[PDB]
């Protein structure tokens, strides 16, 4: 409707297996440009599937989904492709010195890059350096956030991070660096929900809560 509405779901139901259990049932939300939507809920609630729908990997059986522009997705499982740290961050996107430095900093990769003699030109892989789980999760988040997009779909990017690093990156990256970007963050932490403009709590594909942090706290 309005140019400032980034993503809308109206009366959305969807199925992974035709004739089976709906993975999402009667979903409704509207996200304005620059807002942070937190998507909470237990294992199997339909959180990753909700992102998949936005990405066109799962079409709804009913209802309407609309999103403006380009998406950048961060998978709940971190990954790399054999190559340099720098290529693992920027591949497929033009180099921009400032953005690059700001992303490395916000994702706490500055320190790790400085330990190598080849710095961000260090080759990742069996035959080079093997990143730890934590390093791989930070580089996967940096890859997603570096890309210029109208909508960032961050699927539990801190699931494999320690809580001290998670707090720092949630604050420096998701809240500060990305302050005016449209973000859908899959997280069930109260520490994160506190900062969201809107919250969707999914339970077995259904919307158990949709509203502000004040409305949630009141419940």
């Amino acid at each position, epitope marked *: 409707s309005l140019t400032t509405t980034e993503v809308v779901m109206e009366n959305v139901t969807a199925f992974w297996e035709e004739g089976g259990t709906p993975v999402l049932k009667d979903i409704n939300f509207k996200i304005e440009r620059g807002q942070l939507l937190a998507v909470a809920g237990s294992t199997g609630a339909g959180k990753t599937s909700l992102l998949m729908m936005i990405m066109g990997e799962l079409e709804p059986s009913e209802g309407k989904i609309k999103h403006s522009g380009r998406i950048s997705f961060c998978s709940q499982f971190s990954w790399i492709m054999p190559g340099t740290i720098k290529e693992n961050i920027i591949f497929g996107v033009s180099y921009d010195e400032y953005r690059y430095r700001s992303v490395i900093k916000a994702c706490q990769l500055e320190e790790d890059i400085s330990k190598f003699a080849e710095k961000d030109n260090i080759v990742l892989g*069996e035959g080079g350096i093997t990143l730890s789980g934590g390093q791989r999760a930070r580089i996967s988040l940096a890859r997603a956030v570096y890309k210029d997009a109208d909508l960032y779909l961050l699927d539990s990017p801190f699931g494999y991070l320690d809580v001290l690093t998670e707090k720092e990156i949630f604050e420096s990256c998701v809240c500060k660096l990305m302050a005016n970007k449209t973000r859908i963050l899959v997280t069930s932490k109260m520490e994160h929900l506190k900062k969201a403009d809107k919250i969707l709590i999914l339970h077995e594909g259904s919307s158990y809560f949709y509203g502000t942090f004040s409305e949630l706290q009141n419940l």
Partner: nanobody
Amino acid sequence: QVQLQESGGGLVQAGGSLRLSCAASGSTFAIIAMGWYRQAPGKQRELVAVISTGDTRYADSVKGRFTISRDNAKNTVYLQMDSLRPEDTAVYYCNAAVQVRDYRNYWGQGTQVTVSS
């Protein structure tokens, strides 16, 4: 814990098309991301396309011509190569980022793509 096998490579004239496929097999595995690389003799392997889940990236040299896609039910990735040029001549490899209880990447053994003038 995973084996990758490419197919679809061969001889084609400039302007023509080719569809590369990469089949992952094994027993217990979850593919996180799949990439396509190309290697000219005596040179480094060059990443040309990568797909995680519905998020794709391309090397500048291949944009608008190559398309990476997945058959999620089948553990396969494809590289649709259109408007092929002689400089696309190389061995093409697929690479899979996988969870087999620990994180690992696996290489395929490659498929020759030869583009004539």
